Design a protein around this ligand. Structure first.
Ligand SMILES: O=C(NC1CC1)c1ccc2c(c1)OCO2
Ligand SMILES: [Zn+2]
Length: 140
């Protein structure tokens, strides 16, 4: 599990999105596994506007932050998880690391701030849903 809190906006994996998230929807995309919902109390995180391929992610199926090199956001054949079938996911940045289903929502961060959240995990690869192209989060 896990969310980003960029102001009064909560960023989560679309597949972990709660009834409250859907009842306070702002934007969602199934091909990315992203959804953003409105909050009443403000959060403590900032989004990265950059082309970094290095950072640190949180891996809940280990309780560790791991430093990683990660691939640029792309259309990636993911395969059967507990929460999706085998399929392509868009804007998925890839790194070599531990990612099980429940790791989803772990933050990937660089020197520029939050890069994205864990979305995918298979064959010793962790996949992150990029949020860097979503420029509209910082304002409004
Ligand atoms: O190891 C993977 N998981 C599923 C095969 C079981 C995996 C397969 C294809 C990918 C990928 C990850 O990231 C870029 O495209
Ligand atoms: Zn960066």
């Amino acid at each position: 599990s896990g969310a980003i809190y960029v102001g009064n906006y909560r960023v989560v994996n679309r597949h972990l999105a709660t009834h409250n998230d859907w009842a306070n929807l702002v934007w969602e995309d199934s091909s990315r596994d992203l959804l953003v919902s409105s909050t009443t109390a403000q959060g403590c995180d900032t989004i990265a506007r950059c082309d970094c391929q290095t950072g640190v992610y949180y891996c809940s199926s280990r309780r560790k932050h791991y430093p990683v090199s990660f691939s640029k956001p792309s259309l990636i054949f993911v395969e059967a998880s507990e929460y999706y079938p085998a399929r392509y996911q868009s804007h998925l940045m890839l790194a070599v690391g531990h990612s099980e289903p429940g790791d989803c929502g772990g933050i990937l961060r660089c020197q520029h701030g939050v890069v994205g959240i864990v979305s995918t995990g298979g064959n010793g690869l962790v996949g992150f849903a990029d949020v860097r192209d979503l420029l509209w989060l910082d304002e409004e």
